[model samples]
Target chain A: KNPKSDKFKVKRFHHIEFWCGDATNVARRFSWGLGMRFSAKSDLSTGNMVHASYLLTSGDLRFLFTAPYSPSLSAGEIKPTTTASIPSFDHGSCRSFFSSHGLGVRAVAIEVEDAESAFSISVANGAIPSSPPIVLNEAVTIAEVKLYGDVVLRYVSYKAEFLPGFERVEDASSFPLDYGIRRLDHAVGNVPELGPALTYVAGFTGFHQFAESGLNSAVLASNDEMVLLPINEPVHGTKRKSQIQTYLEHNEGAGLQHLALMSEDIFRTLREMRKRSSIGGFDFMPSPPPTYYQNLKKRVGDVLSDDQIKECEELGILVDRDDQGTLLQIFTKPLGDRPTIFIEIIQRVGCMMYQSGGCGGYGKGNFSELFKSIEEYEK
Target chain B: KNPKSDKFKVKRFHHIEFWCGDATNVARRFSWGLGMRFSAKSDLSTGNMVHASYLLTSGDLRFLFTAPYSPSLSAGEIKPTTTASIPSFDHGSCRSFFSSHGLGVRAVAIEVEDAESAFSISVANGAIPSSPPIVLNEAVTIAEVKLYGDVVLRYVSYKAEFLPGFERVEDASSFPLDYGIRRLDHAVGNVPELGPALTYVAGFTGFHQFAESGLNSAVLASNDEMVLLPINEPVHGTKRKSQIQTYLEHNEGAGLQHLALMSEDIFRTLREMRKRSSIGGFDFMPSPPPTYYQNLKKRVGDVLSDDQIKECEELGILVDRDDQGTLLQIFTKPLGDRPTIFIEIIQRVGCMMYQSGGCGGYGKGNFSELFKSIEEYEK
Candidate 1:
């Protein structure tokens, strides 16, 4: 069989990139609202005149937000006179993107140990490559593949600089958010109408599904490259559309749904995020129904005391447990103008803390509760 | 005589309105970046599901920024989902206005004691009325007239509470910037080629031209209510386009060029604005030449102290003088991507303090200095 993980190793997430109409505004939102530290920047003065970018990082997760300087109509052609759109930010894949989707995730780059082998394995296994592999320096090599809704899947080497053409910025604002978010936990995606997104990932990357208590709707949880992915699809025959279906309609198609961020002290992290939202006027995911919190007693009243349950309910945090482990989590409202991408704060207990990993799947109880909360917004 | 002034008496400015592609982003910019306090907001929950508005006020200067829920196309028609020009905002004359001019000022509203008489007088003369005078309860009546580019001249009654349909919002944040911006000083427009905008105003409203040392360009200055209007038009002969011509070309034909904001302590306001630019990455108009500052000694060094000139020079604040009074001014780069609408901050001295208005006019020396500074950017 073609080698997958052991023979061609993949690491963790390199960075995520957004193609926005206004990069500086989006970057400012991440800096002040999310309280992420902006570490790097590139613009016309930096020799990259085609586009401008701001690179921000929160722990291990990195984001590169870019807006093009001019819109391209054809090869090497710019339509500066067009009143059709805000012509500054229209480039190739991002051209129709801004007009259609507004600001959105364009790529998710995964850090890899052997880029060549990973590309080869994925391509041989039926993955659709978006771009050819490029050698940046002795330390960096990159390859990319197409994902849902104009989003690209990028493979980058560990020793690489931020991007091949990007130089280290002289001015870095060491402004800290102090949210204490640890690392990328999982990336969630809304796939289709009860379709097989898992089958696609399995074909390309040789991954298998990890069954949870199980979802009545379609959900396939897969793990690779030190990251977990929960792929969601809609199931029919209900009066109301599934959460996955609602996302597809609003996002305009299949796209990244949200990102789960893990933390050491999930309680403190959740509190900081709440403070950030209140101070900055950013919003978080809607609170669960009172009945859901009341049912919480029937669910975990034996393990947690009344005070602890009260605290959890007050903060609007969700708790889920199986025989193997207990998980603490909360979801945030979609960040920008669109209700497509959002944040999920998470922490796990009751397992060997370090290996307390993929085995601790996204809790079904948590997802169902989130569905009721998210459906409220869709209404 | 139709009795332009006595019958249709226009008061001070009521408010200015802008229809933008992303109202929230622009409102955010004006709020935290510009340090203006947000007084009220109307959105989906506010019974105005068609669009949202943010009302930000500084001193008496009120700006109502509005963005539609989606783009529209034609009359009794919507172009949403068809991928036309984000068409929702095309009606009421502002549709093509935003599409062609990007985010230029659409209206410079004047407070009128009699909205119906004001509309009737303007229409009887050479003026074109865009909309009929509409009664908004017993408190207010509003009327509109078409102007250069998509700019509209609005006559509104002071008895009105903001706009008729706007409900008073409860969640007003009392945050203050203390940037010292006082009120709207003057609104500038790039008039038509060789046509006198002052002639039109003189015919419709009882105001005359204030002639300073003239530019080869025709600039018409008039003061009626509290505000000053300096209308500019391009003279037809030069291989190099005049700033007015450049504005006309870039803004697609004609548009609101810039707004001058008044200040009490201009030194503090200038310094604070500089600090904001440094922190938020907003750019200002280019600095004047060294010789321009050196000439300050030959010009006003006898009356002005060395420390004052040095302080002005350090901040790149421009000084304009005549026998009546001296004015301190500085221009900012265009607020956003389009190089159309910008800001000029001004402070006057040696007159009735408050009435030391632009009677001194935007100086010829100042215009020459600004032209050179602006020319660099056009390159």
Candidate 2:
């Protein structure tokens, strides 16, 4: 028997930790507003600072917020001879940063991967290098993505590693470490214009046009309207700007939009996560109602089983089905300040296509309904 | 007759509220970093928005962070419309204004006595008027001070009112509102060059300068020394520019500098606040450590009691004695980002002079020693 073969595999995730001025407050805000949970906190008194941590998750999704203790270490005198010795950094500057952006300290990063090659490919494409690869800390090497800003991301190889003490619990849960993560889903970007900026990100990052939808096309489209256009064809006409143009108008620049997460069993995972009070709960849509599903067969030509169709409709899950396979997905609101980032949970069955065409155009129609519902809610 | 006489001597303070994007984060950052305490928090399920309350000695502070419950209600969408609706207000745009500044709701100023006269005098100057006097129900009457951009100050007056339930916490041991904020004292402003701006603030806002200590003629006269220039002159400068300028180079132009709170007993309060793990603990000078006290008699005349000087040194308090009386003051580290704001605890002992000469010459010497200690610690 091969020793390597006997090792249990642990699923992986990518996380970015921020060191905020107030960890407890960050935890409470995320837990309360975004539905994240209070997982654990650490005592930082052993050193000069104190720190607290909060965890947020929806299915395989996870995020952490860490706050550091700030002490008034500066003496209040101003010396002319020793002016340069003032250590320029002061508590006032720290407070100003936190006052404007919340006391945030971006500390660590964690990313999921099947193999080192795939992870390295991501790093090669503008992922920003973090720590160099080192061996045996475990069977697999974890890579870090270094960004110039205060935040950092760590890429973890789940294919060969175990989650230490929780291995037994993960095994008993019968959920793979990559239980709900399907692929490197959609990533959000804030840009001046939707067309050129998004094109640059997709090309530079090697993220193919897996699926595309925008404000008008996805959220406000009517049942009779087309919510998503084929990747080869422009979603907007040559004379008109795309729906993403509207998002740019609202967002003011190019930045992350929202990352779409794929899941094999979205409804099950969503229900489980909600029951456990995980962060980012499943918010239901008001459109398409139950009536839309009443005549589902006539619209989609009976591609899906009645139970499968009903499951998608009951959970307000959108579906798009084609001859090849079917896909299911749902969206969340923006994550932090400046409604720029969010998450998408997706599931694909017997299909390489991640677009809404998998379950019979339901996803496209749902997008339109989402916009209309938003309009009505705003009023 | 005696009961009625004591009634005229009664005094009270109101509350201040601010609206922002994330209240929990704000509260925690301010409370933990500044040694404040959360007096109350609203229940969840209040939709997408959240509200939190903090306590101070002189007044109460409330913070509200709200997001749209639906896409339409989201600030992401509403902000554009709202900005468009407002008249062109050149509010001094900076490169990264929106992203760097973060949204500030400013304060709602409550009125004391002589509102009509104050309003007339303000209007006589260039101050723009907002709302005419309007009674808010039976309890409060309010006047509005409209400034450029999103700043609005409402002058409020209450009719024969007592402190609210939130303001009065008896037996604070059970509730120990974090920093032991007993009452509001004064608010400090930082301005560039500090000549015209200081004059402007005093002339326009009915605030008079308590004392103006220049680099020359002051105790520790040095060309490059950091000197204290306390201004009560509130009306001379442009509405926000003076304060904004002071913060830019020193604080990167963040918002809200130190707010002074009056404490009856500094030693007791400081000790208790530290024990309870409040925001900022005491930071004292280094050179004038316990050993410096040995030469105390040689430096200054034997005016202060040995016990009093010892108490001041141990607690790191700054003392300024004058013909009127002596006052004690201490400053905490900045409370928010940018080192823009902090908290000052003071006890006025019959001193009519606001000129605490520490920021002049000797003040700089004291800071030099303090900075050296900080450098050693960081290493």
Clashes of each: 8, 92
DockQ for every model, please: 0.18, 0.05
Error of 2 at A242 (Å): 31
Which 10 consecutive positions of candidate 2 chain B have the poorest summed lDDT?
A: B1-10
Candidate 2: residue A130 Cα off by (Å): 15
lDDT of 2 by residue, B1-379 (tens): 0112110111222444443334434543344333444443322222222122333222343332221111232345332233211111112221123223333334435444434444555556544676555443345555555432333334555676222212222332112344445554443344333455443333434433332111211111111111122322122344334333434433334234444566657776666544422212222222234544434444333555788678766766665444444556667644333223455666656522443322221122333434344455455
Q: In model 1, how large is the Cα lDDT of residue B335?
A: 67
Question: Where does candidate 1 clash, by residue pair?
Answer: A284-A333, A285-A333, B71-B86, B71-B87, B71-B88, B72-B87, B72-B88, B90-B95
Give native contacts recovered, as a fraction, per prediction: 0.01, 0.05
Candidate 2 structure quality by residue, lDDT tens digits, A1-379: 1122101122333443444444444544444333333333332321212223444443444555543223322133343221111112233443343333333333333333433553466466656554544333245555554322322334455434122111111221121222344333333333343454334323323433323344321111112111111121124453445545544433332323445555667877555433422111223323355555555555544556788778767666666554556567666544433233455666766643434322333255555444454565555
**Candidate 1 C-alpha error for residue A248, in Å:** 4.5
- Local accuracy of candidate 1 as per-residue lDDT tens digits, A1-379: 1133333566677788887655665666556555467777666445553566778777887878876544321235444433222122345556456545545677777877767777888888877887666665455777777655567667777453466456565453345555677677777777674345665666676554544222233333224425566676776566665666656655567778877877777767767666545323355666776666676787778767888777777778888887767777888776654445787778776666455454345667676665664565455
Candidate 1 shows a clash count of: 8
Q: What is the lDDT of residue A241 in candidate 2?
A: 59
